[PDB]
Every structure is written in structure tokens, then in C-alpha cells.
Ligand binder design. Sequence first.
Ligand code: NI
Length: 56
Amino acid sequence: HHHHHIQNFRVYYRDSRDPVWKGPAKLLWKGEGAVVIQDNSDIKVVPRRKAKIIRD
Ligand code: NI
């Protein structure tokens, strides 16, 4: 199966204990306190404070 990303979004994000922004990733889901991103083959849950959601 394939998780189609939400169109017109890109996301940069940080993992725990690492200040360097990773990305660009696709946005798969927007929740109240977190987002789901897809970075190549990795689908990850990122707290909103660690996500840079860029309208594209
Ligand atoms: Ni899946």
C-alpha cells in the first residue's frame, strides 16, 4: 500500500536530542499535538514543537 501525502506541504523536523533539521519530508497526518511525516522510507511521529510545517 502507499500513504499518499497531504498535498502542498513539506516538513522539516528534528529527532530527539539532535538540533539539526532533517528533511524535506512529506506530511501524512496533522494532529493536535503531533504530525506524521514520511522521509524516504521512514514514517515518523514528530511533536509539533519539533516540526517546521512549510506550505508549498
Ligand atoms: Ni503503512
